[PDB]
Design a protein around this ligand. Structure first.
Ligand SMILES: [Mg+2]
Ligand SMILES: [Zn+2]
Lengths: 97, 38, 49, 41, 177, 94, 160
RNA sequence: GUAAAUUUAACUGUUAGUCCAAAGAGGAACAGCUCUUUGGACACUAGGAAAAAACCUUGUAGAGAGAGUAAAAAAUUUAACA
């Protein structure tokens, strides 16, 4: 009836001590999300259905505040950078795993 | 009112009341005894 | 390695957090008891010599 | 044969997580029917 | 987890839209927990260069509560830099002018003083009443618990706890009350 | 072979089709996709955790920026789990 | 009848934290025996894969796995490509279970096997001292020795 | 308890000094004032008191993606009198 932590989000943590008392055994099986707790997946007569390719060219300003409103940032991220920094950038960075 | 740091009764009818966070001596018969703590 | 287990191995970190919370509860129980009750299963001290 | 230059991160594993790398929904409980907070349903 | 690399990175570094309520909560405690979530200091993958902030949606900002007399004592000072731009307004005056300015300024003060503060402020969303826009409501995950406990006024005590609490003193029968 | 993923080494086109073929060939009911977890949704940066179930029992879960790619990642996770090519599988004995 | 020491329920009559009762020792030791045993037959059967360990080595603690690389900041008096056993295993574990030493696990319980695969030196490190208006300027170059070990295998044995 | 001291030989350089604690003198029982004495620190490192010479902690030098610590965060809310 006692649990050190709530047992319903990550794993079913059960603690134990060995008979000698020299080591601690932890058993942690994963908790699976219930089906009841889930949610189902959300779902011209005469001419072509012509593809709707309009690309309005917004000027630099209203373009930048549209991007800022879309990505919840400021304008400074979208303003450009000079040749000094652009050539200072490493275009072949090291890559681990 | 006269501004004082220590407040004294100069009459038997003088009374002390704490109003607006400050102590006051009010006298109805001798209004010259009106005193305000600083 | 505690931060490493926190980032990559959340089940082992939850086991460690449960162990720490149980040790804290055992310490609280010993402090309130204040007598000569059994020391606790996880409060036992392994001695070296 | 590798370069004697600065080595970042003095350990290289290719399987850094075995129990699943942490995401925000780890250590997060589920709700009945997956309801959002203050969902009128 | 056996995810592919790009979905695993996306899952690890995705953003969460936490919900927070005003309604007799202290603005400082609201600001503290909101600033932790906005910095992303609640994540074990936190780093200042990792851009791991999360969105915080605070509602009922008009119904905040101040401990003590801070509604009159606390003074917010600004300066429009023309000679004489020094304006000082009490917390009450600032709240009656703008209902979200107090919590906004508290979170802004608690956020770290660098160039990421305005981006975290952009990720913070505040609303004065129960109304929240539908897109944000569809974004919301995890209403966080309130710091205070709503000290529960006398008239909504139930009769069970009222007569479970014993009476302390016996009044005399000859008192007007 | 040591440090690469199964679908990094063997490219596949329809993981959902492969998964339903395997489930029908080992006599398991067809998987149902469900939205286990969801953050955002109206923003440009959503997160969908889509879980694949059979007989109301979870067999896979996958993250994505859209529901469709989350579903395909869940299908790939199910294929990896059924094949034994999971990331936590026993490493090669030398 | 109120006990002599009863306090009416106020906001701070009782401590704010919830009351926590610990399990009785005998049933808890029996539960520990059940958990330790069942984890031991999981080890016996082999219901695990891709073990990890936290190992103390060269005054550091490394979270290593199989097929791993570590860089030790000193020479190790070993030839290249040489198999050794890391023994001071603070922690070992896998999926669904882990084992914790107090502070060290048993050598009969866990082994770590590593291979000396490289004996190199670091990139040159600048040590420079400067104090102004006192003509104080000193420069030194060091190259600390280094040894790259590859963690081959982590093996556990049924001894719980 | 410790390992320095004296002598012999050869010389340079320092000999325009600041704060703090203490005992005093001058001045106003003024001064980041002036003058002696005892002792610190600074004119050499690092951490702290917000920035910081002089206060506190600490000294002997390198690498570490280890650990235990040192000094180290100001508290206060006052007037009824027959
Ligand atoms: Mg002087
Ligand atoms: Zn009078």
């Amino acid at each position: 009836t006692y649990s050190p932590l709530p047992d319903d989000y990550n794993c079913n943590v059960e603690l134990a001590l060995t008979s000698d008392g020299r080591t601690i055994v932890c058993y942690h099986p994963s908790v699976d999300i219930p089906y009841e707790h889930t949610k189902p997946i959300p779902r011209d007569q005469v001419l072509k259905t012509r593809l709707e390719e309009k690309v309005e060219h917004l000027e630099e300003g209203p373009m930048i505040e549209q991007l800022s409103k879309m990505f919840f940032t400021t304008k400074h991220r979208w303003y450009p950078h000079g040749r000094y920094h652009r050539c200072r950038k490493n275009l072949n960075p090291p890559k681990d795993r | 009112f006269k501004n004082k740091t220590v407040l004294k009764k100069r009459c038997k009818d003088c009374y002390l009341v704490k109003r607006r966070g400050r102590w006051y001596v009010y006298c109805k018969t001798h209004p010259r005894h009106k005193q305000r703590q600083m | 390695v505690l931060a490493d287990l926190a980032i990559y191995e959340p089940k082992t970190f939850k086991s460690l957090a449960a162990l720490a919370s149980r040790r804290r509860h055992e310490g609280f129980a010993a402090a309130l008891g204040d007598g000569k009750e059994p020391e606790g299963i996880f409060s036992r001290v392994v001695q070296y010599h | 044969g590798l370069d004697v230059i600065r080595i970042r991160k003095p350990f290289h594993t290719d399987n850094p997580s075995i129990q699943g790398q942490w995401h925000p929904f780890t250590n997060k409980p589920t709700t009945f029917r997956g309801l959002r907070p203050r969902e009128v349903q | 987890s056996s995810f592919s690399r790009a979905p695993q990175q996306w899952a690890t570094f995705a953003r969460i839209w936490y919900l927070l309520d005003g309604k007799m909560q202290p603005p400082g405690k609201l600001a503290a927990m909101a600033s932790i979530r906005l910095q992303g200091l609640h994540k074990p993958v936190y780093h200042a260069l990792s851009d791991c902030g999360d969105h915080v949606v605070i509602m009922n900002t008009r119904h905040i509560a101040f401990s003590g007399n801070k509604w009159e004592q606390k003074v917010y000072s600004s300066h429009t830099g023309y000679p004489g731009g020094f304006r000082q307004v009490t917390a009450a005056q600032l709240h009656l002018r703008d209902p979200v300015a107090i919590v906004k300024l508290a979170i802004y003060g608690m956020l770290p003083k660098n160039l990421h503060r305005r981006t975290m402020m952009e990720r913070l969303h505040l609303f004065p009443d129960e109304y929240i826009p539908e897109d944000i409501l569809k974004n919301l995950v995890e209403e966080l618990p309130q710091p205070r406990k709503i000290p529960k006024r006398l008239d909504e005590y139930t009769q069970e706890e009222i007569d479970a609490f014993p009476r302390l003193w016996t009044p005399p029968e000859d008192y007007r009350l | 072979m040591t440090g690469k993923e199964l679908f990094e080494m063997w490219k596949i086109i329809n993981p959902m089709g492969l998964l339903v073929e395997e489930l029908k060939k080992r006599n398991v009911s067809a998987p149902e996709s469900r939205l286990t977890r969801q953050s955002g949704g109206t923003t440009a940066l959503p997160l969908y955790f889509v879980g694949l179930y059979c007989d109301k029992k979870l067999i896979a879960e996958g993250p994505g920026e859209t529901v469709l790619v989350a579903e395909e990642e869940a299908a790939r996770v199910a294929l990896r789990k059924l094949y034994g090519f999971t990331e936590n599988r026993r490493p090669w004995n030398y | 009848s109120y006990l002599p020491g009863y306090v009416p329920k106020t906001s701070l009559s009782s401590p704010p934290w919830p009351e926590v009762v610990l399990p009785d020792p005998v049933e808890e030791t029996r539960h520990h025996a059940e958990v330790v045993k069942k984890v031991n037959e999981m080890i016996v059967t082999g219901q695990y894969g891709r073990l990890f360990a936290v190992v103390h080595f060269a005054s550091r603690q490394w979270k290593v796995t199989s097929e791993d690389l570590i860089l030790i900041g000193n020479e190790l008096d070993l030839a290249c490509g040489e198999r050794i056993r890391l023994e001071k295993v603070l922690l070992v574990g896998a999926d669904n279970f882990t084992l914790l030493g107090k502070p060290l696990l048993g050598k009969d319980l866990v082994r770590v096997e590593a291979t000396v695969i490289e004996k190199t030196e670091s990139w040159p490190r600048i040590i420079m001292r400067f104090r102004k208006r006192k003509n104080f300027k000193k420069k030194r170059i060091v190259t600390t020795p280094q040894t790259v070990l590859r963690i081959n295998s982590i093996e556990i044995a049924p001894c719980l």
